Amino acid sequence: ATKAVCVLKGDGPVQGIINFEQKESNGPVKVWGSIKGLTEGLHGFHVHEFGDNTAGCTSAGPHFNPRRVGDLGNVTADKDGVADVSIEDSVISLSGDHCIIGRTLVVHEKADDLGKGGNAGSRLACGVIGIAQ
């Protein structure tokens, strides 16, 4: 398993395809793609524990955390509502204990302040992360 993909969907217009690639076991995972239908600005971007969409994104459960492992920061939507995603992350994995295959990728309503807010709302869209060609 060196490649994965996730199709994000929700009750609103938020949708996108997010690719994952990890060329070396235990190596960094590159995450890239595009999300549209977002409000301009920052949106929390997280892997949640369960790849369970039985009740929409709510059944994905909590932030994945065997920074939390699943915490992928924010994505940034432009004035057109489009977020172009290009991240490299050394904590998530496509195998082993930190493997995110079969878990859920979520884009949030609000910005994640990363715990540095000086003193991220609903789940707009999600999908199960699957093995890709």
Q: Rule CB under 5 A: which residues touch Zn ion? A: 46, 63
CB 99 within 8 A of CB 93: yes
Counted residue by residue, the chain has a size of 133
> What is the DSSP code (8-state) at residue 10?
-
Please state, as a whole number, how many other Cβ atoms lie within 10 Å of the Cβ of residue 52: 16
Residue 57 partner contact from a copy of itself, Zn ion, none using kind-dependent CB cut-offs of 5 to 8 Å: none
Q: Which of residues 109-128 bind a copy of itself (CB under 8 A)?
A: 127-128
Which x/- pattern, by CB under 8 A, does the window 82-101 give for a copy of itself?
Answer: -------------------x
Q: What sign does the CA torsion over 93, 70, 62, 124 have?
A: negative
Residue 46 binds which of Zn ion, a copy of itself, none (CB < 5-8 A, kind-dependent)? Zn ion
Cβ proximity to a copy of itself, 17 vs 87, nearer residue: 17
- Tell which positions 32-61 bind a copy of itself, by CB under 8 A: 49-54, 61
Residue 65: exposure state from Cβ atoms within 10 A (0-12, 13-18, ≥19): middle
Cβ atoms within 10 Å, residue 128 = 17
* Least distance (Å) between residue 121 CB and a copy of itself: 23
- Residues near a copy of itself (CB under 8 A) are 1, 4-5, 7, 17, 49-54, 61, 101-104, 127-133
